[PDB]
Coordinates of C-alpha atoms and ligand atoms in Angstrom, one line a residue:
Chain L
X1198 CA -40.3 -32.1 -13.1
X1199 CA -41.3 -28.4 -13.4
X1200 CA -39.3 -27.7 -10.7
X1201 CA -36.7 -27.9 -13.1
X1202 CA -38.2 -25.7 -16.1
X1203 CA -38.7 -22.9 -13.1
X1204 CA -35.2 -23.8 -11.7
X1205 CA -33.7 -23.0 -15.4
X1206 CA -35.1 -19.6 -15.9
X1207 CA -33.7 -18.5 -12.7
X1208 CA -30.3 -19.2 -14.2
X1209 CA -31.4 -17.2 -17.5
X1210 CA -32.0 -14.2 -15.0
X1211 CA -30.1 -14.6 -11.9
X1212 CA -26.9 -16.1 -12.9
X1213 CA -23.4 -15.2 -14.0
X1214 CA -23.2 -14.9 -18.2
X1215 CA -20.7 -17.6 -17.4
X1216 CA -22.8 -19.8 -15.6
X1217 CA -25.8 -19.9 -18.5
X1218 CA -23.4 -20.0 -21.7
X1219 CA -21.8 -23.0 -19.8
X1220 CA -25.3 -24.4 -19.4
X1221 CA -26.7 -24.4 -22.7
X1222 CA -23.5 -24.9 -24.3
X1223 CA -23.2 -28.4 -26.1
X1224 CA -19.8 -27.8 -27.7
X1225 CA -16.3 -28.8 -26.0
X1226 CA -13.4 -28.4 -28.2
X1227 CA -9.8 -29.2 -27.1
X1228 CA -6.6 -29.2 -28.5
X1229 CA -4.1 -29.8 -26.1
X1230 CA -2.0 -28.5 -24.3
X1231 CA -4.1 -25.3 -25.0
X1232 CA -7.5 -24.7 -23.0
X1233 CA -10.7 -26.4 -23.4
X1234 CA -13.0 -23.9 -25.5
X1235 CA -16.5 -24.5 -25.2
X1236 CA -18.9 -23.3 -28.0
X1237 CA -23.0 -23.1 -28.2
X1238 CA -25.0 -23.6 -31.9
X1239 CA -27.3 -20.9 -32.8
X1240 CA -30.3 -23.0 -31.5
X1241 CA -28.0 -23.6 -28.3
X1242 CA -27.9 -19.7 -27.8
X1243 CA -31.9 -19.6 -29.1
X1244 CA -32.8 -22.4 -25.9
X1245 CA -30.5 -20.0 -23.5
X1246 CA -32.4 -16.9 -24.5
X1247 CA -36.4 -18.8 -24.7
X1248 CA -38.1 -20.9 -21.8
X1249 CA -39.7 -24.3 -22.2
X1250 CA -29.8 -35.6 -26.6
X1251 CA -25.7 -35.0 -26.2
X1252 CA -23.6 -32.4 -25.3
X1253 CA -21.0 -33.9 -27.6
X1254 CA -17.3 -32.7 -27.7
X1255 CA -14.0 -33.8 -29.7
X1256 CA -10.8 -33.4 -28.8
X1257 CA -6.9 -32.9 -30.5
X1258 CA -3.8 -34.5 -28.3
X1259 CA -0.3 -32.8 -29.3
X1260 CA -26.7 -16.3 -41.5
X1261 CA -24.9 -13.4 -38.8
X1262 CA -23.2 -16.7 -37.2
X1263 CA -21.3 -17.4 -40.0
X1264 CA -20.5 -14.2 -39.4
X1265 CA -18.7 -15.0 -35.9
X1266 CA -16.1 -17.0 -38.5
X1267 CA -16.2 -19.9 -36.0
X1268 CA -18.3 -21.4 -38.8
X1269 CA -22.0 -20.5 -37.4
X1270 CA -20.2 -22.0 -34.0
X1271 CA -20.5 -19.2 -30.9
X1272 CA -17.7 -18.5 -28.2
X1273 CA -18.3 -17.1 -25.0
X1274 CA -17.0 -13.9 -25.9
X1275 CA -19.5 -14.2 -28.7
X1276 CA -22.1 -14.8 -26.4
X1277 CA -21.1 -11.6 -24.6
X1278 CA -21.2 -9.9 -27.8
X1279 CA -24.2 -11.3 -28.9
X1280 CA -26.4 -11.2 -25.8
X1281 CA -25.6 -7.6 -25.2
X1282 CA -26.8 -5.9 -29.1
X1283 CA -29.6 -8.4 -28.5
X1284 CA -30.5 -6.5 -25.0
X1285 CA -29.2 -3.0 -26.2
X1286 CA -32.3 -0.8 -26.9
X1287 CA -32.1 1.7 -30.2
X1288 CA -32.2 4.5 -27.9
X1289 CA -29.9 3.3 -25.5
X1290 CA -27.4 3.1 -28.1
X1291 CA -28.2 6.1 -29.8
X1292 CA -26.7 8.6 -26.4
X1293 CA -24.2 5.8 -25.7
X1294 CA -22.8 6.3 -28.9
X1295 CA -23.5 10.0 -29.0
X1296 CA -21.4 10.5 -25.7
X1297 CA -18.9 7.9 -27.6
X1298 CA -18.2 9.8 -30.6
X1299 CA -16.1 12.9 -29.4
X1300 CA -15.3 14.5 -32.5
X1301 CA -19.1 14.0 -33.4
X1302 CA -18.0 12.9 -36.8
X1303 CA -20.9 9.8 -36.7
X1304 CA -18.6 7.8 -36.5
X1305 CA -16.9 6.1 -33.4
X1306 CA -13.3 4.7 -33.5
X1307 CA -10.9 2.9 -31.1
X1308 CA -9.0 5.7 -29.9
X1309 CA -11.7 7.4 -29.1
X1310 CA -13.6 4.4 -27.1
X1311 CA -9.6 4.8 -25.8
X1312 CA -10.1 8.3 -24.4
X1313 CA -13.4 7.9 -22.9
X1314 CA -12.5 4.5 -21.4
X1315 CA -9.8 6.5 -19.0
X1316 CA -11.7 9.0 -18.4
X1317 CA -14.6 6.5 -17.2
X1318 CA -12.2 5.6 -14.3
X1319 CA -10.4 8.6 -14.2
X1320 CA -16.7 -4.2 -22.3
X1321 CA -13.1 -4.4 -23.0
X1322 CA -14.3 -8.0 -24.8
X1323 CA -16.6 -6.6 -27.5
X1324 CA -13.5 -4.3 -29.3
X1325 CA -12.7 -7.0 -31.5
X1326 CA -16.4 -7.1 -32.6
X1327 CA -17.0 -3.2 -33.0
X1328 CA -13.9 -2.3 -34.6
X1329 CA -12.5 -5.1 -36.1
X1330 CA -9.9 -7.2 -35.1
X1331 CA -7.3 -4.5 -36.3
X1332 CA -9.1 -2.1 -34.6
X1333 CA -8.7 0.2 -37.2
X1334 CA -12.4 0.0 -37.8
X1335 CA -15.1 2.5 -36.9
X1336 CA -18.9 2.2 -35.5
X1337 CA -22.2 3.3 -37.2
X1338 CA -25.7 4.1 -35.5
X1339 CA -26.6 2.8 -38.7
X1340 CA -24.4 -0.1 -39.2
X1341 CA -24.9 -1.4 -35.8
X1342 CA -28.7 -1.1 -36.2
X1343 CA -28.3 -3.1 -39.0
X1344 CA -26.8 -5.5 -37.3
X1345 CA -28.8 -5.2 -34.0
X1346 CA -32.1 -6.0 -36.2
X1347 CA -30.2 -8.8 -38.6
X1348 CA -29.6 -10.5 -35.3
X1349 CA -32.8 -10.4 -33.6
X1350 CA -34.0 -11.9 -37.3
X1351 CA -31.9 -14.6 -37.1
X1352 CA -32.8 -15.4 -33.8
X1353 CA -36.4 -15.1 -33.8
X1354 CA -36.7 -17.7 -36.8
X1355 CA -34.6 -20.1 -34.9
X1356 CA -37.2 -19.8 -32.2
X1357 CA -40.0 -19.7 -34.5
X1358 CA -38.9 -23.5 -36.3
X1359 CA -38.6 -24.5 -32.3
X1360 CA -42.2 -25.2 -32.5
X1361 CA -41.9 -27.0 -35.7
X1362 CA -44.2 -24.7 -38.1
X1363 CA -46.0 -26.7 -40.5
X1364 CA -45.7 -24.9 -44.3
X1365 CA -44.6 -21.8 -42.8
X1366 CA -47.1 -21.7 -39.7
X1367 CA -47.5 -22.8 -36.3
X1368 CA -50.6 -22.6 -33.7
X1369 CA -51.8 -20.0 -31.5
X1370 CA -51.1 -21.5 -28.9
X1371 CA -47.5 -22.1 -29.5
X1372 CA -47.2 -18.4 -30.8
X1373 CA -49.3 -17.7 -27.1
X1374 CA -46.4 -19.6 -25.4
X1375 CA -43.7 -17.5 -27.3
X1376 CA -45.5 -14.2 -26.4
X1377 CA -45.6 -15.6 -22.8
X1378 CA -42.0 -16.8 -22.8
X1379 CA -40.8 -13.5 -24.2
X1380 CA -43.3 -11.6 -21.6
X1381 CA -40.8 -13.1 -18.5
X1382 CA -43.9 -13.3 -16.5
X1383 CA -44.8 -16.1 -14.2
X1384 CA -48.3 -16.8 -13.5
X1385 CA -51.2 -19.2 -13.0
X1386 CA -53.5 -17.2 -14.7
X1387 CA -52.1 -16.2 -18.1
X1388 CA -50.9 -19.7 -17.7
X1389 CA -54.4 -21.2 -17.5
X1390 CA -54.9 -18.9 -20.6
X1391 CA -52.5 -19.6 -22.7
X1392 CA -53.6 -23.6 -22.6
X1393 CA -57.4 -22.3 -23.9
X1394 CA -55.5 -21.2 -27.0
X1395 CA -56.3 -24.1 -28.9
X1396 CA -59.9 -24.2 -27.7
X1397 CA -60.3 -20.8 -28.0
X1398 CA -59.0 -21.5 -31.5
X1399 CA -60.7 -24.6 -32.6
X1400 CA -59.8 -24.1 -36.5
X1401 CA -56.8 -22.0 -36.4
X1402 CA -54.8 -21.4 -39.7
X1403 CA -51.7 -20.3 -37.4
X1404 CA -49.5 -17.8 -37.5
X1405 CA -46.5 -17.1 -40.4
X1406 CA -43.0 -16.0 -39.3
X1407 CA -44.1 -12.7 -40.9
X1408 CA -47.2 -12.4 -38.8
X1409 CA -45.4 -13.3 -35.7
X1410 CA -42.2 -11.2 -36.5
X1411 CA -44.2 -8.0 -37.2
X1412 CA -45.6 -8.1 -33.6
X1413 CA -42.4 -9.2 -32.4
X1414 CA -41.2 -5.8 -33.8
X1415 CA -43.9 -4.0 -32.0
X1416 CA -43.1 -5.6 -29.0
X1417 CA -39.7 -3.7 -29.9
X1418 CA -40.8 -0.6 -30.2
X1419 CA -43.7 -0.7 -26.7
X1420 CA -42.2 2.5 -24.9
X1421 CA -42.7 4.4 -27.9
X1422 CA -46.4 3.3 -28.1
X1423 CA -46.7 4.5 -24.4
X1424 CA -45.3 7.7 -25.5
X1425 CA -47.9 7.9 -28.5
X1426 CA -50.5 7.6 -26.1
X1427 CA -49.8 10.1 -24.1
X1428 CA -49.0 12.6 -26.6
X1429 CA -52.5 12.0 -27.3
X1430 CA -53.9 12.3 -24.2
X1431 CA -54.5 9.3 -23.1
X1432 CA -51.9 7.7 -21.0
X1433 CA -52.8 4.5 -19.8
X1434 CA -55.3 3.8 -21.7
X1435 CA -57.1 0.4 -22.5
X1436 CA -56.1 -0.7 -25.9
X1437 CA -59.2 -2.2 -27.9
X1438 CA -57.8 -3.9 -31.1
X1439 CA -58.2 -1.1 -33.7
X1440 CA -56.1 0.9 -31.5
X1441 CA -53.3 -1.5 -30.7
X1442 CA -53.5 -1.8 -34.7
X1443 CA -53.0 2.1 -35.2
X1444 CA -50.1 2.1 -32.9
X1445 CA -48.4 -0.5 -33.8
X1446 CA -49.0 1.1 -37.4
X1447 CA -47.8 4.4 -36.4
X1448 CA -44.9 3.6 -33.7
X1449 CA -43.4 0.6 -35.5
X1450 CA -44.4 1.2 -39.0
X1451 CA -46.0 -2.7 -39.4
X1452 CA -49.3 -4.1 -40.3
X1453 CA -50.8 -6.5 -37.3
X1454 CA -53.0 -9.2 -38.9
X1455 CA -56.0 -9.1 -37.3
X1456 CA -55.5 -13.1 -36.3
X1457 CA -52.4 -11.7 -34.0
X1458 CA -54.2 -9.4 -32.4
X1459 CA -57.1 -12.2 -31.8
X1460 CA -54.7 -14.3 -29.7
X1461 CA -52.7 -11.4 -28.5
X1462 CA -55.9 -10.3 -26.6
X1463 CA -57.2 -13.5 -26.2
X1464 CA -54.4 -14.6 -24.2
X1465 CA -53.8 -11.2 -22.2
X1466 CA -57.2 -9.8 -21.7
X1467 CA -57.2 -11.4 -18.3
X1468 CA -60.4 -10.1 -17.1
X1469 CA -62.5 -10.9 -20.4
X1470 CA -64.1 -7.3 -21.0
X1471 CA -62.4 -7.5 -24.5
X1472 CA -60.1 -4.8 -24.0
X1473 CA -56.4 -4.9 -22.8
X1474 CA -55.5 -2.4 -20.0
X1475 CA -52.0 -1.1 -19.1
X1476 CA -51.5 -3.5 -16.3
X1477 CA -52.2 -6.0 -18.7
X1478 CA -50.6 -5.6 -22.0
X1479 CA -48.2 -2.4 -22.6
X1480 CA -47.2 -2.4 -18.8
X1481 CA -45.6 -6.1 -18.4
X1482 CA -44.2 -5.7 -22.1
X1483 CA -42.5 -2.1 -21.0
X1484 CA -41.2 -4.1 -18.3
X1485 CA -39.4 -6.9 -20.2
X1486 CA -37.2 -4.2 -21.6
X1487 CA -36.4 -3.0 -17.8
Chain U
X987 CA 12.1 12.9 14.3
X988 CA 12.1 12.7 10.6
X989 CA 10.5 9.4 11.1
X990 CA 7.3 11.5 11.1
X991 CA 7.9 14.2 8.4
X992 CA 8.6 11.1 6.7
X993 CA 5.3 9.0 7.9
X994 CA 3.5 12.5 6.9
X995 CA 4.3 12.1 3.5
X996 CA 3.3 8.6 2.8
X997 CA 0.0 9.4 4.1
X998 CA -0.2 12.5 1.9
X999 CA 0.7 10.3 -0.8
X1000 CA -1.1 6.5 0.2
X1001 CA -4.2 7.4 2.2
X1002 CA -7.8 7.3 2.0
X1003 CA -9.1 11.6 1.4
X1004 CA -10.5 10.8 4.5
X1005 CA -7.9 9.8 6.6
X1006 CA -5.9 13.2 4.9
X1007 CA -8.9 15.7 6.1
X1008 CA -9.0 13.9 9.3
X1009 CA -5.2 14.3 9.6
X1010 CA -4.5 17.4 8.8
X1011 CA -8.5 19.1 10.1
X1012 CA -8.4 21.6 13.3
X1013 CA -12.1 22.3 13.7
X1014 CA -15.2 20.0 14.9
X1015 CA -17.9 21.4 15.5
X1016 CA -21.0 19.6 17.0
X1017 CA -24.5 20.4 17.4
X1018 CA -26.5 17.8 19.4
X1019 CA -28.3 15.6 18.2
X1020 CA -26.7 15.9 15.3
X1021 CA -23.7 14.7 13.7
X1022 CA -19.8 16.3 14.1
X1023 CA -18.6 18.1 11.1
X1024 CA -14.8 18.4 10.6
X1025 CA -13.7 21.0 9.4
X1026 CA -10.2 22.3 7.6
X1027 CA -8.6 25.8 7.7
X1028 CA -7.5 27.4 4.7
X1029 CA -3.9 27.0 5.8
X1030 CA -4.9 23.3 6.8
X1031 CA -6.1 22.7 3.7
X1032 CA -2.1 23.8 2.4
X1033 CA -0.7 22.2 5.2
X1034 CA -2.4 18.9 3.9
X1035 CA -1.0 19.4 0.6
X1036 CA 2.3 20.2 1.2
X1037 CA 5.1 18.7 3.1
X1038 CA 7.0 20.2 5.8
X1039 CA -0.7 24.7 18.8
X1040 CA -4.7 23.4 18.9
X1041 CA -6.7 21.2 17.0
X1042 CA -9.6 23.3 18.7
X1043 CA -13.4 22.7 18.7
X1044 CA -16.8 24.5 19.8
X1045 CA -20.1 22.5 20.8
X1046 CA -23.3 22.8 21.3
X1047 CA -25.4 20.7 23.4
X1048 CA -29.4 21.1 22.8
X1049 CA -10.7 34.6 -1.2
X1050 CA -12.2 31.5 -2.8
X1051 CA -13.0 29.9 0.6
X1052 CA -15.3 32.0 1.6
X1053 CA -16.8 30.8 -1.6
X1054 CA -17.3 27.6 -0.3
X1055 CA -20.0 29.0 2.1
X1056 CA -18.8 27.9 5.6
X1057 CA -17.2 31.1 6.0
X1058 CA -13.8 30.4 5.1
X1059 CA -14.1 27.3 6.5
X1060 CA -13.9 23.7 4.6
X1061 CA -15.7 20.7 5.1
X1062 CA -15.0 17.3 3.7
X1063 CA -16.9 17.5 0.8
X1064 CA -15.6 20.7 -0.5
X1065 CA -12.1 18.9 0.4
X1066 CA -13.2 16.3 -2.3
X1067 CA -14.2 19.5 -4.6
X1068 CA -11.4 21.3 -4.3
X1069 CA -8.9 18.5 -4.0
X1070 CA -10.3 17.0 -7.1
X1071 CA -10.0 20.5 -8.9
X1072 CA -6.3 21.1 -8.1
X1073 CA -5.5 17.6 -9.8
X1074 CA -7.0 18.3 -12.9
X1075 CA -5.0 19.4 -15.7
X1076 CA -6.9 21.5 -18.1
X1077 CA -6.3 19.1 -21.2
X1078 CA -8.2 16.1 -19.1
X1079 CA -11.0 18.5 -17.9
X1080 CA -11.1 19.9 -21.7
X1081 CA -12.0 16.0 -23.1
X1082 CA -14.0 15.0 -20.2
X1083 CA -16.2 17.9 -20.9
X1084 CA -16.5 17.2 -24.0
X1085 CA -17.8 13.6 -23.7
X1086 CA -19.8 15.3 -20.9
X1087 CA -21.5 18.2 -23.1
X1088 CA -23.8 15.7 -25.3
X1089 CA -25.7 18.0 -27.1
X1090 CA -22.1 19.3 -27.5
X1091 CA -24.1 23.0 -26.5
X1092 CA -20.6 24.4 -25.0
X1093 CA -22.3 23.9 -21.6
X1094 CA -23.2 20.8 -19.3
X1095 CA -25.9 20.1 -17.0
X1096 CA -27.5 18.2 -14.2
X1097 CA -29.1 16.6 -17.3
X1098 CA -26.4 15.7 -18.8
X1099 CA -24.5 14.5 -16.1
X1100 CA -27.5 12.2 -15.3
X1101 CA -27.2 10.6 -18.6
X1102 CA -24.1 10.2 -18.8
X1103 CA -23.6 8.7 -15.2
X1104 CA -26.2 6.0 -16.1
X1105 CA -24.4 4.6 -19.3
X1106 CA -21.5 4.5 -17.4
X1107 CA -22.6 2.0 -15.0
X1108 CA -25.0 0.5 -17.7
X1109 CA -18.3 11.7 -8.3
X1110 CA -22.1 11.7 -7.3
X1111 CA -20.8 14.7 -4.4
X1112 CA -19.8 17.3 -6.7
X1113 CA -22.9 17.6 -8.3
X1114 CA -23.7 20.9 -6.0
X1115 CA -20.4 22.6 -6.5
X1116 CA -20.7 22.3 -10.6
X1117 CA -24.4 22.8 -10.7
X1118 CA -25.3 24.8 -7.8
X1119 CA -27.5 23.1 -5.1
X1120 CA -30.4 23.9 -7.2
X1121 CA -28.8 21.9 -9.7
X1122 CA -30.0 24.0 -12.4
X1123 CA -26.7 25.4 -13.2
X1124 CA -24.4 24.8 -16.2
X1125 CA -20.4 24.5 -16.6
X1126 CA -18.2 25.7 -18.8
X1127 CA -14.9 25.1 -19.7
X1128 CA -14.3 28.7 -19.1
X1129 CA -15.8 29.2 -16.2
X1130 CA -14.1 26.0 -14.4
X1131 CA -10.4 26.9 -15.8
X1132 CA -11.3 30.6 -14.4
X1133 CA -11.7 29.0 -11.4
X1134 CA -8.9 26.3 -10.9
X1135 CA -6.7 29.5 -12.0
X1136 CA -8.0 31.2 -8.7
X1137 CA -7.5 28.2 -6.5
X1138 CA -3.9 27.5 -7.5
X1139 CA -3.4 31.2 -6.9
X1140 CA -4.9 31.3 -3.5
X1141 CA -3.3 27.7 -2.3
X1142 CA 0.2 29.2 -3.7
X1143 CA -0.5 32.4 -1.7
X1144 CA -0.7 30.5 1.2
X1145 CA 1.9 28.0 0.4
X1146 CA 4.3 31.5 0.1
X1147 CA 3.2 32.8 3.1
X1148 CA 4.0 29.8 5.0
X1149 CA 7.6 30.8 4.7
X1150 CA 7.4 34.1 6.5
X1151 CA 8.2 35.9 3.8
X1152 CA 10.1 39.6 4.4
X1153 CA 8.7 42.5 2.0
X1154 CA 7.1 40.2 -0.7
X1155 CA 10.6 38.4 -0.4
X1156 CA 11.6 35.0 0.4
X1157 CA 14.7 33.2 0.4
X1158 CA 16.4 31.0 -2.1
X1159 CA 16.3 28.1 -0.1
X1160 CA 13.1 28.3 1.2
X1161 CA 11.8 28.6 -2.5
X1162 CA 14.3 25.6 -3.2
X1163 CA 12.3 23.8 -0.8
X1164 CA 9.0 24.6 -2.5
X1165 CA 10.3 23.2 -5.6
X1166 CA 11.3 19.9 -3.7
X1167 CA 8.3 19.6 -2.2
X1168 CA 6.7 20.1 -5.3
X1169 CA 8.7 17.4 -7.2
X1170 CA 7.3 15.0 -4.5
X1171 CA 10.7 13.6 -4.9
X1172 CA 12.5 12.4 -2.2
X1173 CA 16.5 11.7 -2.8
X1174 CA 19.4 12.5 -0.4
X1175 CA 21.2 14.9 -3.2
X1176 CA 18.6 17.0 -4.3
X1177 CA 18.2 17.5 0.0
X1178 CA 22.0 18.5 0.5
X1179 CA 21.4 20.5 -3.0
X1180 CA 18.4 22.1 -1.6
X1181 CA 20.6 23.1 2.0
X1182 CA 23.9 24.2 0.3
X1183 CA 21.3 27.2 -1.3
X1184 CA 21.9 29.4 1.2
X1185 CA 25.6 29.2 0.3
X1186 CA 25.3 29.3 -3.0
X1187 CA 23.2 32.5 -3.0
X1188 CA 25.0 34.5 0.0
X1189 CA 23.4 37.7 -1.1
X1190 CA 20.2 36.9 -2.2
X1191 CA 17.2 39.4 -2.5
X1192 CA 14.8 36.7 -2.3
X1193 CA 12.3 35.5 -4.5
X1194 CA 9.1 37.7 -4.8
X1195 CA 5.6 35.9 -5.1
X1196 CA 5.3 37.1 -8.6
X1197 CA 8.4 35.5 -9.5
X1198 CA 7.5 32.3 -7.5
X1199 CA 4.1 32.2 -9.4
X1200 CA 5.7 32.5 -12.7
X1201 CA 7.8 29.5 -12.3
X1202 CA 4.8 27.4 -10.4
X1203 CA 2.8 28.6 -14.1
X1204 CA 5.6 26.6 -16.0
X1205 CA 5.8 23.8 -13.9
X1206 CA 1.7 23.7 -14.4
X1207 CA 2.6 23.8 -18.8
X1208 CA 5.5 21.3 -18.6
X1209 CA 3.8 18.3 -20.3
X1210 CA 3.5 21.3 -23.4
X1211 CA 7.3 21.6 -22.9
X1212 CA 8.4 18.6 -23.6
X1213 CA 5.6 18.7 -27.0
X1214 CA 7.1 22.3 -27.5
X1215 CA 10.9 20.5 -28.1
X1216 CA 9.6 17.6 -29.3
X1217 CA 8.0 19.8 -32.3
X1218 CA 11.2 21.6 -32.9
X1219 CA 12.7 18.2 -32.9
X1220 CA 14.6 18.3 -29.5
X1221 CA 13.0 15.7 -27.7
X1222 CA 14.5 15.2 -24.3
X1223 CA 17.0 18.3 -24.9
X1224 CA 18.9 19.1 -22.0
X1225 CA 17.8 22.6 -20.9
X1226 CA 19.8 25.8 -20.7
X1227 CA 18.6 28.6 -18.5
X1228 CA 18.3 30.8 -21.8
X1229 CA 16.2 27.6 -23.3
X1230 CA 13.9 27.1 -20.4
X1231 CA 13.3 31.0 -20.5
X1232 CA 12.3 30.6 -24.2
X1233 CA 10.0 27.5 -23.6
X1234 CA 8.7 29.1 -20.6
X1235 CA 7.5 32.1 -22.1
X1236 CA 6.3 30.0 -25.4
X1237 CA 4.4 27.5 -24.1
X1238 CA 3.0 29.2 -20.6
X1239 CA 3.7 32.8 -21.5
X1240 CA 5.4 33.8 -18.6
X1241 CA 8.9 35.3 -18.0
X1242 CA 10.6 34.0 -15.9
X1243 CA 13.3 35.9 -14.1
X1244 CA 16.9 35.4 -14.6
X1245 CA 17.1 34.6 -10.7
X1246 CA 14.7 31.9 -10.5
X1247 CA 16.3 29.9 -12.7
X1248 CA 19.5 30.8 -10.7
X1249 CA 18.0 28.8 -8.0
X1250 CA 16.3 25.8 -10.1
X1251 CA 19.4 25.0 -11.6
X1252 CA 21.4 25.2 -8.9
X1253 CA 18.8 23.1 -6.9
X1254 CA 18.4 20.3 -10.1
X1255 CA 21.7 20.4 -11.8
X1256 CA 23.0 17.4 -10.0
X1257 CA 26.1 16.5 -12.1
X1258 CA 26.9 20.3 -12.3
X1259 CA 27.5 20.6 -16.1
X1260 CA 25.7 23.9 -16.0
X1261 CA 22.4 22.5 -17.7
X1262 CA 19.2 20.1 -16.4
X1263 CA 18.9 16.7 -18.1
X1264 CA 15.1 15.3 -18.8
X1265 CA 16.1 12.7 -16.2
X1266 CA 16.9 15.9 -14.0
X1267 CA 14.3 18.5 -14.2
X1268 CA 11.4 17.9 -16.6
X1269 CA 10.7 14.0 -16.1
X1270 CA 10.8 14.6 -12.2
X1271 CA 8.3 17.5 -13.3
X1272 CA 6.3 16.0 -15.7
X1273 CA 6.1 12.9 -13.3
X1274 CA 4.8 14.9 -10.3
X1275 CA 1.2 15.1 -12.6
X1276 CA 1.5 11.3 -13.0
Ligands
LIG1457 CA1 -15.9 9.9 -33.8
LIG1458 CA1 -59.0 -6.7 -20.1
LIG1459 CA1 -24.5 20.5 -22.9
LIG1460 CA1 23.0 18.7 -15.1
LIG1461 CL1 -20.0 14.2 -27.3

């Protein structure tokens, strides 16, 4: 029945927003004669965004989720919301909001959004959720990156208690699969790896949220590390551990355990010459991010 | 046969561009193996613009026109350019540039266009005519209302001379008509207004191009009309040919001669109290930019 776990990640990449929110959902909430809404959890929204027992639902005749005010409950047009900061790079954002803010007062309003909406014909959803409800309220690189990192927090640690850590830990192995879930990459080889995790690491202390979290980070930040290379002169170039460690240092300001960077390579250096080379590290990692 | 002058119209006004250039085209030229070009005359290019013997062709087997390159001549995509120029009122072009101009550097690029083109998605054949076909070229606000000024002049030329003017001079009516074609307004009254001109003004020494241009200036400012009486809180004043002098000369800085307006009102003053209504001379205007 893997058929089925392959089936379901084509639906988490080719398939209407519609289609996968409706999928993972497990909330239906009527309360008639109005519409059916139907509503994910945060670990429903975690499962739709991370490969690998009722949709319950009550009806009326007649943490940044809390945030949502649905009481930690998530609406499709939260999902819209949500799933697009989650997939909207820094730098992305950064020009975006640039090209936004017209006055160039750092600050972005809804008459502005307004203007440059027109002039676009010449993400009508997410309004609400940038400038309030009133719409009286006004954007921030800043406060947006806040948010942007609050959220990918949030999510990450409902992904990390997926594999049921044990006192704040869980195995290589299962840190492997979320390094191979997030890589989006299908194969029989790193697959075949990632298994040999828990031989490769017989003992095994695991990995804490804040080991995992900092490399998730530097995952974050992987076209900026390409760019450091290259400033350096040397573009392309195999990582050994020490220098993924320097990077990761210099590009995303975090400190990789050294244990990390054992599994990370341990899992990814596919032809076993203990270094990791474009095509198999940095590459595939750029590429998860388009 | 006014079926047709009619069926003219609606495709002048509810037509693909290409069905217009098509229309209203006199040249193709062909050069085995390649492709046929179409191609518009300067006073095709009017003629498709404004209501009211050979489509010839040459093959081979085997001014601000002449700015355009093709010798005076027009092809489809500088129909695009230019038509797209003419309809753009400097306050939209002013904005537009601005969200355009990201490092807000008074200028825009190729560059910049790329960018901004992207996070739209996340207009592709003017690219040459703003940047050059080297692309390395920059626009400015400046340059670009420097050169719609020149355009509107030259078409306007045209449009004047299409009317066999006599010494600089033509007639009331036929300047009558300009302004009804110009209103894009089609109503039985304003038509028998527009006939009985020739009565009203007997005499008549004729409009001179000067004096038509001056008026076509205003109609270009009337959206800052109705703002200018607005201010001076008069919103939707009825005009009086000493008050539409005034505004004229405020808020487009032209004068505009007593004789003109002679012929405006008695071409828009429908109810013949002497003065035009909003309903009867600015809305019609005003709506004739969208
Ligand atoms: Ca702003
Ligand atoms: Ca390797
Ligand atoms: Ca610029
Ligand atoms: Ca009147
Ligand atoms: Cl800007």
């Amino acid at each position: 029945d893997r058929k089925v776990m392959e089936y379901e990640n084509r639906i988490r990449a080719y398939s209407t927003p519609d289609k996968i929110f409706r999928y993972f959902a497990t909330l239906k909430v009527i309360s008639e004669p109005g519409e059916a809404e139907v509503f994910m959890t945060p670990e429903d929204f975690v499962r739709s965004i991370t490969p690998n027992h009722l949709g319950l639902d009550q009806y009326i005749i007649k943490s940044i989720f809390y945030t949502l005010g649905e009481c930690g409950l998530i609406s499709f047009s939260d999902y819209i919301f949500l799933t697009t900061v989650l997939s909207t790079p820094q730098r992305n954002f950064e020009i975006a909001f640039k090209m936004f803010d017209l006055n160039g007062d750092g600050e972005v309003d809804m008459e502005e959004f307004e203007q440059v909406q027109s002039i676009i014909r010449s993400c009508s959803a997410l309004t609400t959720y940038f400038f309030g409800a009133d719409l009286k309220g006004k954007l921030t690189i800043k406060n947006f990156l806040e948010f942007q990192r609050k959220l990918q927090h949030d999510v990450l640690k409902l992904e990390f208690e997926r594999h049921d850590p044990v006192d704040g830990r869980i195995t290589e192995r299962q840190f492997g699969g979320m390094l191979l879930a997030y890589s989006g990459v299908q194969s029989k080889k790193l697959t075949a790896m990632q298994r040999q995790l828990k031989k490769h690491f017989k003992e095994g202390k695991g990995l804490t949220f804040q080991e995992v979290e900092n490399f998730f980070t530097f995952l974050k930040n992987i076209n900026d590390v390409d760019t450091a290379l290259s400033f350096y002169h040397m573009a392309g170039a195999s990582l050994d551990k020490v220098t993924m460690q320097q990077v990761a240092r210099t590009v995303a300001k975090v400190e990789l355990s050294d244990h990390v960077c054992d599994v990370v390579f341990a899992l990814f250096d596919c032809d076993g010459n203990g270094e990791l080379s474009n095509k198999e590290f940095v590459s595939i990692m750029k590429q998860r991010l388009m």
